[PDB]
């Protein structure tokens, strides 16, 4: 009814507040920021998803744009709080709209060590293994045979 | 509370009528992983269906050879046969012929209209045929099995004997062509994250992907029936058989949680059992020396917390001591 | 206890006065989570005003980094102890060994 | 010396034991190494940073 | 759930007047309380405005002529 | 034949010890071995009916961060030991036991005033060391059966139940099983091959029964499967 009632509700922490949160954070992007920002990529926009705990879960690849290791880095987060600002963050400062470095045309989406090692292991072939010299009809049949 | 949850599907996409994507939400904290793994291992290996098993050609005995009339090699024809989605009735194994030549490419609809079986995709091309005097035909033989059958287990069959029928080609008895399970986070009104299952699958068109899921479910249920609680709730029958009094009466007095002096002066009066104390009043308690307010109040409050009263009338004593 | 130790652990546990050390060797007289009463051997006992030793184990108390420091007993009743031996392992210590 | 100590127990000398996945329940190829390592918890918790 | 706006950049000259048009349309539809023309998926006004700019049924010239004709019909209703 | 095959069955409940046991199921056609093994292992490790302690109530000590004159260990180690033990209840689901003891010595779980329904699986588990003579310990122990695991702080529902200072909360990490290993080998049959027989070894707390735990896991899996055995466009 009033603002005090809403404050009492949100401090009571009931269950009818979580769906409202999911609704208001459905398409409201926030602004993630690294503590040192050498270039513009130190500040980006991201769609938030509710997680558990007290730490901020970040995409593994995008950290390469921040040069932020996972040894205890503290990142900041801000909200646009403005229709124009929300639209701008969704249009320009979004991570998908920033894939090439401002210095070089090379992508800042280069894969990191874990994924490249996995893919190299998947592609590196030996001379003799199970299923050597057979024939397959397609990639899905190959995945089935592997599983 | 020994009561888990049940999922409620919200997305069953049947795009292309043979590539399905189903969701299941919500599940427990770890049920999604095991469910996806079990369903995948069942659909891939333990899923009875039907597929091609044996090929018969005119005179091409070796795979390292080529027959004129086609613009491909025998390996291409074998790969095409490997994807021949056909279904059979209760018959265990049946042969079909393709004694047909001509000009245009040979497709699945060229097989004889055997009423006992039926091809899923008759328009599926078998082999692009040469447009001149392409005189070549063949024969197929399909069976029903458990799952994917490589050529290794058929090498032994080839080693057994060698008639004209002894050829080599794999068999995908599993009607499902591809399967992929994934887990994601689901939000309950209070529980924040639980396993939400997303199963993508694609079959050869022999059966509905949801029908294949239901078949896997019923085969798993048939496998587990040997251990399913022996019933729905394992005990739809309740009875009752208890004595008239409580076993506390048989218990010694030291189980009353009293002071050491009170316990000593109570045991000194040959009162070493609770039931020997419930059936008597405290007029004799004060007669024993060193029985003051402390011990009397402690005993009476203990028996009050236990509900029983000091001074009762029972004849069944002592059963059985 | 750290499995792969360097030997120095013992030393670095007995040098820092974070743990309770036996000032005089004797026999354990009274164990408790807070008070430890040790009967001093008559040889190491002082000539006059003879008696015992009483160690007060530092219980849960705030340290300089808002960290709970506490000492727990690690001896049994009547256990003979010598001079300089450990009596109660403090924080990050176990059986007289630095166990962070 | 570590090889001989491992040989003393029933543990393999190579120091690499095969592992089985908990989710899919299959065997990992390239038998990984497993041991008992001493670890420390730093004074950089999340309750005082958020 | 909008993930790529590249096709919008290929439609309008650049992103500045693009987001200007977006903000104008969102203010006219959410705060202004008008009716959109694109089917919604239970979402906010931002993604709906982005989708309707991506289609092509609204732009700077379209909003100009729409608001001009709206002022015209408003003055006519006043008359 | 190739379709509508057999079903497994339990053929051994041999317990190599009081806690460690080993059951065998047979037969399994092919591929079902590892599938069923992993499924049963995950179901057992996920959640099983447990009967651990949820909260205690001691008269002498007020808060778990203090000391009680007469005992050797600290209240925190006391609570950890109380968590370590396991009990078995049959009639009721929740029960308040009483632990009362005096005199110098190692006070174990056998010193509690047990009831008819509540049973101790192992009395040798030491609880405390009453090193002083005039030291009388007397405390209440609440044990309620649940499903899974719940932390201590997150188990609160109001602010009035914690008003009694003596109510000391502990994380009810009830889990009868501790480790479940499984393997598959060749089975026995009149005239057939490649039959699979599964063997599951279980190191548990000893409270739950091996066959009972296996049956409960199978029932839970069957319920979760029946949730979608005939799945349709339902809402
Ligand atoms: Mg860093």
């Amino acid at each position: 009814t009033t603002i005090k009632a809403a404050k009492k509700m949100v401090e009571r922490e009931e269950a009818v507040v979580w769906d409202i949160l999911d609704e208001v954070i459905r398409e409201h992007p926030v602004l993630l920021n690294r503590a040192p920002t050498l270039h513009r990529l130190g500040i980006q926009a991201f769609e938030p998803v509710l997680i558990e705990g007290k730490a901020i879960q970040l995409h593994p690849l995008v950290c390469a744009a921040y040069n932020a290791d996972f040894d205890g880095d503290q990142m900041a987060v801000h909200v646009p709080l403005t229709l124009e600002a929300q639209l701008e963050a969704r249009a320009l400062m979004m991570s998908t709209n920033n894939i090439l470095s401002p210095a070089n045309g090379e992508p800042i989406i280069v894969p990191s060590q874990d994924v490249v090692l996995g893919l190299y292991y998947m592609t590196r072939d030996c001379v003799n293994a199970k299923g050597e010299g057979m024939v397959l009809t397609g990639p899905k049949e190959a995945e089935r045979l592997y599983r | 509370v020994t009561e888990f949850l049940k999922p409620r599907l919200v997305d069953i996409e049947q795009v292309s009528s043979t590539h399905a994507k189903v969701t299941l939400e919500p599940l427990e904290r770890g049920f999604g992983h095991t469910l996806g793994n079990a369903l995948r291992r069942i659909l891939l290996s333990s899923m009875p269906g039907c597929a091609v098993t044996e090929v018969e050609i005119d005179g091409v005995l070796h795979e390292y050879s080529t027959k004129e009339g086609v613009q491909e090699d025998i390996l291409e024809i074998l790969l095409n046969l490997k994807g021949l989605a056909v279904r059979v009735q209760g018959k265990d194994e049946v042969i079909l012929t393709l004694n047909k030549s001509g000009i245009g490419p040979v497709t699945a609809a060229d097989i004889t209209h055997d009423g006992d079986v039926e091809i899923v995709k008759p328009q599926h091309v078998i082999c692009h045929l040469t447009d001149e005097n392409a005189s070549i035909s063949m024969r197929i033989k399909v069976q029903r099995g458990r799952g994917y059958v490589p050529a290794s287990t058929r090498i032994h069959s080839e080693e057994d004997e060698r008639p004209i029928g002894r050829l080599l080609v794999d068999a995908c008895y599993s009607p499902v062509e591809r399967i992929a399970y994934n887990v994601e986070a689901a939000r309950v009104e209070q529980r924040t994250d639980l396993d939400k299952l997303v199963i993508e699958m694609e079959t050869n068109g022999t059966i509905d992907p949801e029908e294949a899921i239901r078949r896997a479910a019923t085969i798993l249920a048939e496998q587990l029936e040997a251990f399913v609680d022996l019933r729905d709730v394992r005990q739809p029958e309740v009875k009752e058989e208890k004595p008239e009094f409580d076993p506390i009466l048989l218990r010694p007095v030291d189980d009353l949680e009293l002071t050491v002096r009170s316990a000593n002066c109570l045991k000194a009066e040959a009162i070493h059992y609770i039931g020997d104390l419930v059936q008597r009043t405290e007029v004799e308690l004060l007669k024993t020396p060193n029985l003051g307010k402390k011990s009397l109040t402690e005993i009476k409050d203990v028996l009050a917390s236990r509900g029983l009263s000091l001074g009762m009338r029972l004849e069944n004593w002592p059963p059985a001591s | 206890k750290p499995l792969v130790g360097t030997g120095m652990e013992r030393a670095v546990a007995v040098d820092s006065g974070v743990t309770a050390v036996a000032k005089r060797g004797g026999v354990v007289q009274y164990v408790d989570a807070s008070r430890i009463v040790i009967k001093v051997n008559e040889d190491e006992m002082y000539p006059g005003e003879a008696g015992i030793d009483i160690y007060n184990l530092t219980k849960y108390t705030r340290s300089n980094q808002n960290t709970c420091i506490n000492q727990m007993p690690c001896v049994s009743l009547g256990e003979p102890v010598e001079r300089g031996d450990v009596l109660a392992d403090g924080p990050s210590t176990d059986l007289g060994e630095l166990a962070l | 010396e570590i090889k001989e100590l491992l040989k003393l127990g029933d543990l393999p000398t190579s120091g690499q034991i095969r592992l089985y996945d908990g989710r899919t329940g299959e065997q990992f190829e390239r038998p990984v190494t497993v041991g008992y390592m001493y670890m420390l918890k730093l004074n950089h918790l999340v309750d005082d940073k958020m | 759930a909008r993930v790529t706006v590249q096709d919008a950049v290929e439609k309008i000259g650049n992103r500045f007047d693009l987001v200007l048009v977006a903000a104008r349309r969102a203010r006219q539809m959410q705060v202004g309380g008008k009716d959109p023309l694109v089917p919604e998926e239970n979402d906010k006004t931002t993604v709906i405005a982005l989708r309707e700019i991506e289609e092509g049924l609204i732009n700077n010239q379209i909003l100009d002529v729409r608001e001009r004709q709206e002022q015209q019909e408003q003055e006519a209703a006043e008359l």
Side-chain angles (χ1 to χ4, degrees), chain A, chain B, chain C, chain D, chain E:
Chain A
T1 77
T2 177
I3 187 167
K4 293 186 296 182
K7 178 186 302 178
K8 207 62 60 183
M9 286 180 57
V10 304
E11 66 87 29
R12 197 179 299 105
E13 204 55 69
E14 56 270 354
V16 64
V17 73
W18 289 126
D19 46 354
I20 308 302
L21 191 60
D22 168 68
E23 187 180 340
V24 302
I25 319 297
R26 170 153 182 80
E27 288 307 314
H28 189 281
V30 296
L31 201 72
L32 287 182
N33 173 37
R34 180 68 169 99
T37 63
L38 272 301
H39 55 298
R40 55 172 180 170
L41 291 180
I43 283 185
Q44 294 189 2
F46 282 97
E47 287 193 7
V49 289
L50 303 181
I51 52 184
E52 268 297 350
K54 289 181 174 57
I56 293 179
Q57 278 187 355
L58 185 54
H59 189 268
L61 188 151
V62 63
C63 83
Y66 306 97
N67 197 7
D69 47 359
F70 281 95
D71 61 348
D73 286 8
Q74 312 180 34
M75 264 192 176
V77 60
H78 310 263
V79 290
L81 276 189
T82 285
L83 191 46
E84 291 85 342
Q86 294 174 29
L87 290 178
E88 165 71 14
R90 185 145 281 165
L92 280 84
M93 289 182 297
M94 207 57 180
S95 87
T96 59
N97 311 329
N98 308 322
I99 64 148
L100 310 182
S101 66
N104 309 326
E106 276 62 48
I108 203 57
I109 313 296
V110 64
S112 169
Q113 50 265 21
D114 263 13
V115 290
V116 70
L117 166 65
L119 293 205
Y120 175 86
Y121 182 84
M122 194 200 305
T123 50
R124 192 204 58 89
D125 58 84
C126 82
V127 299
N128 194 13
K130 301 182 62 181
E132 160 79 15
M134 66 187 307
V135 286
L136 273 297
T137 44
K140 307 156 174 182
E141 301 89 312
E143 179 194 12
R144 155 168 56 185
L145 188 67
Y146 173 54
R147 284 300 182 180
Chain B
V1 300
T2 72
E3 173 191 3
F4 286 92
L5 313 181
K6 307 175 67 65
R8 292 303 175 186
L9 54 90
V10 308
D11 197 349
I12 315 291
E13 173 175 350
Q14 208 170 359
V15 57
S16 48
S17 71
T18 180
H19 182 68
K21 177 191 185 66
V22 302
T23 200
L24 281 183
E25 195 274 336
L27 278 81
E28 216 61 33
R29 203 166 59 97
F31 284 4
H33 276 278
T34 183
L35 271 192
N37 181 35
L39 267 297
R40 182 183 63 180
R41 204 156 298 268
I42 284 181
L43 290 178
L44 286 184
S45 44
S46 60
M47 180 46 64
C50 274
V52 76
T53 316
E54 188 162 300
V55 73
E56 308 296 328
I57 209 174
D58 44 358
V60 181
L61 180 58
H62 321 271
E63 307 89 349
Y64 43 91
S65 44
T66 299
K67 165 65 178 56
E68 268 293 332
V70 295
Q71 41 266 34
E72 299 86 1
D73 201 358
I74 314 297
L75 305 186
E76 279 81 357
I77 294 93
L78 290 182
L79 296 161
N80 297 331
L81 302 160
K82 196 170 179 176
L84 287 199
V86 296
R87 97 189 61 181
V88 188
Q89 285 294 143
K91 181 59 64 60
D92 193 18
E93 155 186 3
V94 69
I95 80 178
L96 300 88
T97 187
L98 200 40
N99 291 33
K100 170 184 173 301
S101 167
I103 296 307
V106 54
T107 174
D110 296 328
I111 311 280
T112 52
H113 310 76
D114 302 327
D116 208 9
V117 302
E118 60 180 10
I119 309 104
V120 172
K121 301 184 306 177
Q123 82 290 341
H124 176 270
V125 61
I126 310 304
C127 167
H128 311 291
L129 209 66
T130 303
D131 274 339
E132 57 93 19
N133 293 327
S135 44
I136 178 63
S137 279
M138 59 285 301
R139 185 164 71 85
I140 56 181
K141 185 174 75 178
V142 309
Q143 307 171 5
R144 53 181 71 257
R146 184 67 66 198
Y148 193 92
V149 167
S152 87
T153 187
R154 298 195 59 194
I155 285 179
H156 305 99
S157 315
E158 173 72 36
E159 185 265 313
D160 293 335
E161 68 271 346
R162 187 265 182 191
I164 311 296
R166 271 322 172 194
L167 274 302
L168 298 178
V169 56
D170 286 3
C172 63
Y173 288 123
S174 316
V176 56
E177 195 261 3
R178 79 165 295 255
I179 180 68
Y181 74 99
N182 199 333
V183 291
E184 290 175 346
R187 198 267 312 257
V188 192
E189 66 273 349
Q190 179 47 52
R191 202 68 39 81
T192 309
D193 66 318
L194 283 174
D195 299 8
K196 174 183 64 59
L197 182 55
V198 171
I199 290 184
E200 185 84 49
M201 72 176 306
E202 194 160 2
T203 69
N204 314 324
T206 75
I207 50 180
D208 214 356
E210 55 187 20
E211 160 63 33
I213 292 180
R214 290 192 301 274
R215 199 161 306 185
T218 178
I219 208 178
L220 189 60
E222 289 172 345
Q223 274 282 63
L224 292 175
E225 180 62 34
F227 304 103
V228 288
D229 209 39
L230 275 83
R231 214 182 274 106
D232 272 8
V233 299
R234 98 186 176 97
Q235 200 178 22
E237 167 64 67
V238 53
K239 291 181 293 298
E240 175 262 358
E241 175 57 42
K242 67 168 294 297
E244 61 277 1
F245 60 92
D246 307 340
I248 317 295
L249 310 186
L250 295 94
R251 298 189 175 186
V253 291
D254 50 10
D255 310 334
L256 290 183
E257 192 67 13
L258 72 164
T259 55
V260 63
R261 169 178 185 171
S262 44
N264 287 140
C265 54
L266 182 66
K267 284 192 172 185
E269 274 281 346
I271 306 180
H272 304 264
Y273 303 93
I274 295 178
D276 284 312
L277 190 55
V278 189
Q279 204 181 357
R280 51 155 290 162
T281 66
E282 59 99 11
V283 57
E284 190 205 343
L285 283 183
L286 261 62
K287 285 297 183 178
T288 312
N290 311 118
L291 273 297
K293 62 188 66 57
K294 179 255 298 180
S295 45
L296 189 76
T297 45
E298 281 167 358
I299 302 307
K300 72 167 64 76
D301 296 0
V302 163
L303 63 93
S305 45
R306 292 281 79 79
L308 59 96
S309 158
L310 186 54
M312 289 297 303
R313 291 267 68 89
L314 59 93
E315 190 49 51
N316 45 1
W317 191 245
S321 171
Chain C
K1 42 177 176 302
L3 298 187
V4 283
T6 65
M8 197 61 54
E9 291 78 6
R10 174 73 33 86
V12 61
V14 307
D15 274 298
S16 157
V18 66
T19 182
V21 69
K23 304 189 306 175
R24 294 197 300 278
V27 61
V28 162
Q29 184 171 344
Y30 166 67
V31 184
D32 203 322
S34 44
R35 153 183 276 99
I36 292 299
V37 162
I38 303 302
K39 172 166 298 305
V40 185
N41 299 138
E42 52 189 12
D43 294 325
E44 208 178 9
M45 200 161 56
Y46 285 89
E49 51 270 27
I52 52 189
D53 285 354
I54 295 190
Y55 299 88
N56 302 334
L57 262 60
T58 66
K59 270 313 171 188
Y60 315 91
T61 176
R62 178 188 164 276
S63 60
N64 298 95
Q65 297 300 322
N66 299 331
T67 317
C68 164
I69 46 177
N70 199 332
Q71 301 167 333
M72 295 179 54
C74 46
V75 289
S76 70
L77 297 94
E79 186 167 358
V81 288
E82 285 76 16
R83 196 196 69 84
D85 199 311
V86 301
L87 295 182
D89 296 316
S92 315
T93 47
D94 166 66
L95 299 186
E97 212 173 28
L98 187 54
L100 304 91
Chain D
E1 313 185 19
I2 308 185
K3 294 304 182 60
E4 291 181 349
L5 185 53
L6 282 164
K7 197 72 173 185
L8 172 57
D10 292 331
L11 275 301
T13 318
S14 178
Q16 291 186 352
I17 305 181
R18 59 163 62 170
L19 282 197
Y20 290 162
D21 198 308
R23 305 169 302 175
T24 181
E26 71 183 344
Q27 178 204 14
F28 297 112
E29 52 273 9
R30 277 86 177 105
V32 303
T33 182
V34 285
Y36 274 68
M37 155 174 284
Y38 201 66
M39 298 180 57
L40 300 176
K41 177 179 179 181
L42 275 298
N43 201 262
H44 286 289
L45 307 96
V46 72
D47 290 1
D48 49 349
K49 294 301 188 308
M50 165 190 159
Chain E
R2 189 51 47 87
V3 288
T4 318
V5 305
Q6 180 64 31
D7 303 68
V9 173
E10 319 204 351
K11 175 186 179 64
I12 320 293
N14 48 341
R15 289 160 290 270
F16 295 157
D17 53 288
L18 186 142
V19 66
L20 282 192
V21 180
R24 287 197 178 99
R25 193 63 168 84
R27 189 195 69 172
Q28 290 312 299
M29 66 199 302
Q30 192 265 302
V31 176
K34 78 187 308 302
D35 213 317
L37 311 94
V38 194
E40 62 164 290
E41 322 309 307
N42 185 216
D43 43 10
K44 301 176 177 300
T45 174
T46 45
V47 55
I48 298 286
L50 269 296
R51 195 180 313 170
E52 74 179 77
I53 310 162
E54 279 277 24
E55 196 286 327
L57 74 171
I58 186 56
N59 66 31
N60 204 333
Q61 186 84 339
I62 298 285
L63 66 83
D64 186 315
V65 301
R66 193 96 70 88
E67 69 182 2
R68 192 168 179 176
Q69 194 246 341
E70 189 65 31
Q71 295 297 323
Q72 282 199 332
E73 54 205 291
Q74 172 194 2
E75 301 306 320
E78 294 164 63
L79 189 150

